[PDB]
Structure 1
Amino acid sequence: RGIPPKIEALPSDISIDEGKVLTVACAFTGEPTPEVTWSCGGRKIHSQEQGRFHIENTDDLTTLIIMDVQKQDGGLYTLSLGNEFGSDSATVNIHIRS
């Protein structure tokens, strides 16, 4: 009959060295499958097929990938989920290390 979305696991903080690939994964649940939005600074992140930012969404996992991570990529990344029955949201603090 419908189950609102829930983010089941997302880390609160991640530190990665400058220049590496960062991968941030999150498992979620919901019926129907929730729509997934990643954002940073009130702006939605979109996959770039020939760029550094990529989002891979399956029916219960979403992954943010940032290739060759730079200091400018650091910040608070929010995952938001929504379906007909509700919404959820959580933030991960991404730190880029020298």
Structure 2
Amino acid sequence: GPGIPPKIEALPSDISIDEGKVLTVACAFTGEPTPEVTWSCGGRKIHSQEQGRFHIENTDDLTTLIIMDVQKQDGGLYTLSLGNEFGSDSATVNIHIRSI
């Protein structure tokens, strides 16, 4: 086909979750060819780690950020960026971790 610039369908502005739980943030998108997905926090790319607490699952129209056993230190602004040959898009979600 002709190609389609990437577009984050929607990302929440804010999400609150209890400390100690597993956070799951799914976000739908469009783009052709499939956009490269980058999640970042503090200006730094988050890497999906088999043995860590942070995991990322990407498909052709969805990306899901997973944070296991969330801690207060995990709170903050997470940026999702999408890039392909026809353009880019980004959005930020503020993750709030609730005490106790």
TM-score (norm 2): 0.96
Deviation per residue, 1:26-67 (Å, 9 max, x gap): 000001110000000110000010110000001100000000
Report the CA distance between 1:13 and its aligned residue.
Answer: 0.2
- Could you tell me how far 1:80 is from its partner in structure 2? 0.1
C-alpha displacement of 1:10: 1.1
Provide the residue aligned with 2:78 in structure 1: 77
Q: Residue 9 of structure 1 aligns to a residue in which SS?
A: coil
Distance in 2, matches of 1:9 and 1:24, equals 11
Whole-angstrom CA distance in 2 between matches of 1:93 and 1:27: 17
Structure 2 residue runs of 5 or longer lacking an equivalent are none
RMSD: 0.4
Alpha-carbon displacement from aligned partner over 1:63-89 (angstroms, at most 9, x marks no partner): 000000000000000000000000000
Corresponding residue for 1:24?
Answer: 25
Work out the CA distance in 2 between the residues paired with 1:30 and 1:54.
Answer: 22
For structure 1, which runs of at least 5 residues remain unmatched after alignment? none
1:21 CA drift (Å): 0.2
Report the TM-score when normalising by structure 1: 0.98
Q: Report sequence identity in percent.
A: 100
Number of residue equivalences? 97
